[PDB]
Each structure stands twice: as C-alpha cells, then as structure tokens.
C-alpha cells in the first residue's frame, strides 16, 4: 500500500511532497541544492529526502529555488537550497544542499511557513508573523528595505492575530482571524489590492474588499488571489497572461470578484508565477492564466483568461493543488498525484524531461497506474562535454 500523500508543494523548477510516516520526497531541478539530497543532481522521479527521516516533519513548502520544512513535535524549522539575500534564514547568504535547522525558530510554535521567490514568512500558533530574506520592495513588512538574514518579527501585527500569509515574487499578503486582508511589498502592478502603484514597507489593510471577510490568500509574480467567507474568489494585479481570470487582460488595483465562479464555493487556491488554480467544495479544479508550457492543464498551450475545469480520470475529485512557476501538482481523493506543465528538469516526477499540457499521473506516489556544500565549479559554468 502506497503511503498517503499528505502535502504537495511546487517551486520554480522542483517539487516536494510529504507522505504518511512523515517521509519527505523531492524531485525536479537539483542544481541549486533545493532537493536536499546532498548533491547538485536533478531527480526525474520522487526521491526520498533521507536526511529528514525520523524528524517528524509535518509540513514542506517550496520557494523558487529553496525549500523549507518543519516539525511541530521537534519544534524545528529546516531550510535548504539557494541562499542569496538570506532567504534560508541562517544569518548568512550561503547555499545549502542538505537541510539545516533555522536556529532562530527553534522552540517556536509554527502554524505555517510561506515561501516567496526570495523571502519567507512564518506564522506562529499565537498569530504572530516573522519574516526573512529579500526586502528591496518592503516585502518583509519590517518598515525598511534592508534584507534580513535571520527571522524578524513583524511589529506592525502586534495585537492582530494572523490566520495565514502568502508570498509572491516580491510581495506578501495576509488574512487575519477576523477576516481582514493585508498586502505589502512590491505594488507596481496593483497586486497589493490597495488602489495605487506604490510599494508598502509595512502591512497595509485592503480597505475595499467588497464588504466581505477574507478566509484565504495566495500570490504570484504580479497577482494575488483571495477567497471570502462566502466562498467568493477575488483576483487582483496584472493580467497580461489572463492570470486574473476575469475574461479580459485588464489590470485591477483592488480585489475584483471572479463572477464566472460565483456558481461555486472555493475551498482552496494556489498561485503560480503567472497562472492560477482554484479548488471548489465539490473537488472540481479550475485553472487559468499562463499556459505556454501547459501548466493550466486543459490540453493546449494557449493562455486562458477565464477559469477552465481541469479534468481527471473518472472525474475523481481533487483534494489538494499546488502551482509552481511553470508547472502544477494535484492530489485526488483516490490518493493519486498528478503533475502537468514544464518538465525539463524532471519536476513532473514521471521520469521525463518533457512538458505536458494535461494532467499526468505520478506512478511512484499514486495507488492507480551526501554533502551540505557542492563547489560551484561542478554545477555552474560547466562546458557541455562530448
């Protein structure tokens, strides 16, 4: 009996999953250390991350070229991969090819980790938020633009219990337990939801939410998605690739409700670099946005500016979805895992280096059918040899 897949996460060019028995596996691009196997090799099939066996890992999250995992029992957070700007949180900017504990987070009750492209945030059980990494557009919410190589508390949230956060390329969004929506960081293309093009160095409340309380949020390179207590889905930011999903390519500087999904109750959302996924209460998966590599999953390579249901064998319901930069992963009710989109580095996990534009089952995970440092000269600027 295959282990149940508990968590899937997609990065820029890699994929990570957590299986029952707290087994972590990882696949796709490995040249930056993001797979955590102690080498710089790509992996075309899901590969067990042995260094975390027995650590009671309960959560995994992909950034772009880095990965974070944490253990609630061990009260330990681990990070690895590309380390520039302090995104790994260890007080330096060094690459890591094996997981290392984030010492600053030891013994802290962590409820969630969000990984932007070059910054990370942790939400505690008490609803506080700590952030680290790149801060050039204020995306750490610390009130400056200095990068932080270690986690730092967002003081602006004191007295405000945070339910969850999400991180894009250079911006961050959050929802409170009370249902308030917040945005900060890079705001040039409207993706903060505040009505202007100005960045924010601290969290700023979205004052125009249609009068609804927001339950969830997710981010991409230039867009943001939120879901209301009613189950209504809102998108905002840039839509050159149709990632806002409103039928046009128009900008939106404030949250804009996606009318074509008012039929449905949205239970989960995920944001890719330029595409978007929404999971209904029924287990229907809708995707839209950038589709050059097939990452919308609807059988072609044309961008989609309106939601299109992603189809699965026997219409099995989807229970989890995760977008990367250029690929998408999903878990179904039958404990099957599917992947689609760009696969050049093996990140679809089907033993290939090819793109796919409709969902493809990851046989290794589905019921149905070592060194901390690698010298850059072995993994960068290597002349092709033959």
């Amino acid at each position: 009996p295959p282990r149940k897949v508990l968590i899937i996460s997609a990065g820029a060019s890699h994929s990570v999953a957590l299986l029952s028995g707290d087994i972590v596996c990882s696949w796709g691009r490995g040249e930056d250390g993001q797979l955590g196997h102690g080498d710089a090799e790509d992996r075309p099939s899901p590969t067990q991350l042995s260094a975390l066996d027995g650590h009671q890992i309960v959560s995994v999250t992909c950034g772009a070229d880095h990965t974070v995992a944490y253990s609630q029992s061990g009260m330990e957070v681990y990070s690895w991969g590309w380390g520039d700007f302090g995104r790994l949180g260890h007080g330096n900017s060094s690459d890591l090819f094996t997981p290392l504990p984030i010492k600053a987070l030891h013994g802290i009750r962590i409820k969630q980790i969000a990984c932007g492209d070059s910054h990370c945030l942790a939400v505690t059980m008490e609803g506080e938020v700590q952030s680290w990494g790149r801060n050039q557009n204020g995306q750490l919410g610390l009130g400056d633009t200095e990068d932080s190589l270690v986690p730092q508390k967002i003081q602006a949230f004191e007295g405000i219990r945070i339910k969850m956060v999400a991180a894009g390329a250079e911006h961050t969004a959050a929802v409170t337990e009370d249902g308030d929506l917040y945005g900060w960081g890079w705001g040039r293309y409207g993706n903060l939801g505040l009505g202007d093009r100005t960045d924010r160095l601290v969290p700023e409340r979205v004052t125009s939410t249609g009068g609804e309380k927001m339950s969830m949020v997710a981010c991409g390179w230039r867009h943001t998605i939120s879901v209301s207590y009613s189950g209504a889905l809102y998108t905002y930011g840039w839509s050159k690739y149709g990632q806002l999903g409103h039928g046009d390519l128009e900008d939106h500087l404030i949250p804009h409700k996606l009318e074509a999904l008012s039929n449905s109750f949205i239970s989960q959302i995920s944001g890719g670099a330029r595409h978007t996924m929404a999971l209904t209460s029924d287990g229907k998966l809708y995707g839209w946005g950038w589709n050059k590599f097939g990452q919308v999953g609807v059988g072609n390579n044309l961008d989609q500016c309106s939601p299109v249901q992603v189809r699965f064998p026997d219409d099995q319901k989807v229970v989890q979805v995760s977008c990367g930069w250029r690929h998408t992963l999903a878990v179904t009710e039958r404990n099957n895992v599917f992947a689609w989109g760009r696969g050049t580095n093996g990140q679809l996990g089907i033993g290939e280096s090819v793109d796919r534009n409709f969902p493809k089952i990851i046989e290794a995970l589905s019921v149905d059918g070592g060194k901390s440092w690698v010298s850059p000269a072995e993994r960068y600027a290597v002349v092709p040899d033959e």
Partner: protein, 348 residues
C-alpha cells in the same frame, strides 16, 4: 616573441558582505565602453561605470585600488534565473541589454526604466549558453541565441518572441550543444558558432541555408568563438587551447597553449585593435596571447585575501577587453568568487 605591453592590475572589486556563490559567467562593455555589465550564478546583472570607478577610488603610485561592491556597483537587476551570457543590443543607444539564462530564456531589459521589454522561451527549457546581435544593422538588427538544445535561433527583437527569423542545428545528428554565438563585429554577414561536437561553424546570416564553413581541429567542445577581423576568428576549447582560423578557407593559422582549461567556461575575449587574446584559466590565472605567437605573452595570478581557505579552487571565469582602446588597453576579468580584476595597459 615580443613583450610590448605594460599591463598591470589597477582595481579589484570585492564583497565584504555576502557569502552567496557569485561566479561571474559574463562581462560586457556597453557601446560607449563607459559601462561594464557582469552576470552569473547569482541572478544579478550588475553595472559599473568604469572610468568613474577608477577615477574616484584611485590610490597613490603603483598600488592596487580595492573597492567594495557596494561602492563600485552603480545598480543591478535581479533576474529569475542564473545567467550564462550578456550582450548590449546595438542601435538602442545603450538603452537595452540582453541576457541568456539557465532556464533557456532570452531576456531584454530597458535600462532607462529598469523593466524587462523582451522575453523569449523557445529552446525547450534547455540552457541558453550565448546571445549576440548583428552589428551595424540599425533597424534591421537581429538577435541570436545558442543553447543546449543544439540550435542557434535567430529572432527579431521587435517582433513577437515566439517568432523566429531562422534556426540552425550545426552539429547535425547528435544535436550537440551550441555553446557560443558571435556575429561579425564589423557588420559583415558571417556568424560564428562553437559546438560540443568539438567544431566551430561559420554561417551566412543573410542565408542560413547556405553550407557552413567547418572549423575542425579542437579535440574537445568549442566553448567560445570571437572575431579578430573580417577574415579570422579565434576559438577556445576545453582541450586547453585557443585556435586562430581563416574564415576564407577554414584552416588553422595558429594554436595557443599554456593555460589550464579542461572543464569550465573561463572566458575568451579578443582585443581586435591590438590583436591580443585574453582568457581565464582554472589555476586562478588570467592569460594574454599575441596573435603572432602560440605561447602567452602575459599572465596574472592575483589572489584575493582569504582565498587559500575553503577547498574551493578559485579560477578566472570571465574576461572582456575594452574594444575601443588603441594606445591603451583595458582587460576586465571576473573570478569564480565574484571578484572583479581590472587591468590597464600602455605600450612598454
């Protein structure tokens, strides 16, 4: 063998601050030769105003000037992927710079707005090793990219990026990687490529269907090709040598040896006015050859403070001459640790 140049280390740019890997894979001058752009593993295109860098940080006598990165770097652009290559786009007045990267993507950035203006992803996600543009074309300029997918593709940066003005697969059946692409800098029709089938090729950009000139003699991958003039090109191979070739008959004129290069891209730049060839070396050296002799005329071995430690053998990973020099030359070298080494030369 004549030693005609007093070429000396003037300036070293280094970072106190960051432990991130910072191999420099590309170094290029803008069309005025006032600006140097660098890029590599660290996903940052950095820009330096070179005359002002040297003038504002000068030291007394013959000493070397050491400048911190934060002081030296005017600004930089964060990119989504590791960079293999850079080239300023002619005819844009120094406003646009192109890059190739490890995601197989060619980007163009407008430096007046600091925004991306061109994005092309047509190599199947296979790494782009090299980018260049035709010279003296004005409005007819075209770009080209060479990639691990075994193609050189030619594209018009004014058209939709999905389009293509031409595509060649020089290595043929095995589809070996195209590691370098270079247009004739004087504006003639030749475009040279270097491939992992151990050969270079010279095509006619006006008519890519016409049979290529084959440059055969290397025993390993051709990592670089650069023009000396309309009639000659220089290749580098990971057989540890450079080779000078006649574009008219494809014969090897001379082979240049002495440096160490069996694995990495270490840079190749040809100072056309001086007929001097510069390259890096895997034993942490910068080499300069004169066209006339197969033995190097000059080597430098700068070692940054604290290099000895660490088990990582530092090497010189990129070089670039200032082409407009005639009576003065300038050679910029980039280390596998992100350190820049600026050499200035006058006749002896």
């Amino acid at each position: 063998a004549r030693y005609e140049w007093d070429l000396s280390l003037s300036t070293v740019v280094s970072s106190s601050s960051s432990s991130a890997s910072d191999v420099i894979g590309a170094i290029e001058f803008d069309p005025t030769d006032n600006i140097v752009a660098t890029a590599g593993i660290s996903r940052k295109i950095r820009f330096y105003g070179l005359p002002s860098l040297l003038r504002n940080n000068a030291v007394s006598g013959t000493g070397v000037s050491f400048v911190d990165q934060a002081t030296a770097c005017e600004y930089y652009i964060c990119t989504p992927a590791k960079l293999s290559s850079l080239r300023w786009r002619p005819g844009s007045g120094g406003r646009v710079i192109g890059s190739g990267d490890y995601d197989g993507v060619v980007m163009e950035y407008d430096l007046e707005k600091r925004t991306p203006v061109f994005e092309r992803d047509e190599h199947g996600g296979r790494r782009v090793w090299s980018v260049d543009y035709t010279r003296h074309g004005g409005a007819s300029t075209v770009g080209a990219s060479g990639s691990d997918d075994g193609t050189m593709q030619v594209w018009d940066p004014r058209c939709p990026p999905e389009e293509s003005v031409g595509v060649v697969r020089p290595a043929g059946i095995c589809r070996s990687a195209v590691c370098c692409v270079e247009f004739d800098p004087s504006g003639g029709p030749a475009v040279a490529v270097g491939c992992a089938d151990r050969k270079g090729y010279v095509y006619d950009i006006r008519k890519l269907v016409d049979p290529a000139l084959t440059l055969q003699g290397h025993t390993k991958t051709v990592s670089y090709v650069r023009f000396l003039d309309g009639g000659t090109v220089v290749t580098a191979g990971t057989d540890g040598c450079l080779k000078l070739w006649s574009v008219e008959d494809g014969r090897v004129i001379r082979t240049y040896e002495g440096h160490v290069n069996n694995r990495n891209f270490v840079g190749l730049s040809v100072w056309r006015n001086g007929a001097l060839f510069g390259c890096g070396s895997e034993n942490n050296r910068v080499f300069v050859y004169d066209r006339r002799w197969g033995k190097p005329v000059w080597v430098d071995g700068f070692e940054p403070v604290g290099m000895n430690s660490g088990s990582d053998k530092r090497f010189v990973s990129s070089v670039c001459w200032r082409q407009s020099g005639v009576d003065q030359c300038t050679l910029v070298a980039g280390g596998s640790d992100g350190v820049l080494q600026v050499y200035v030369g006058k006749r002896l």
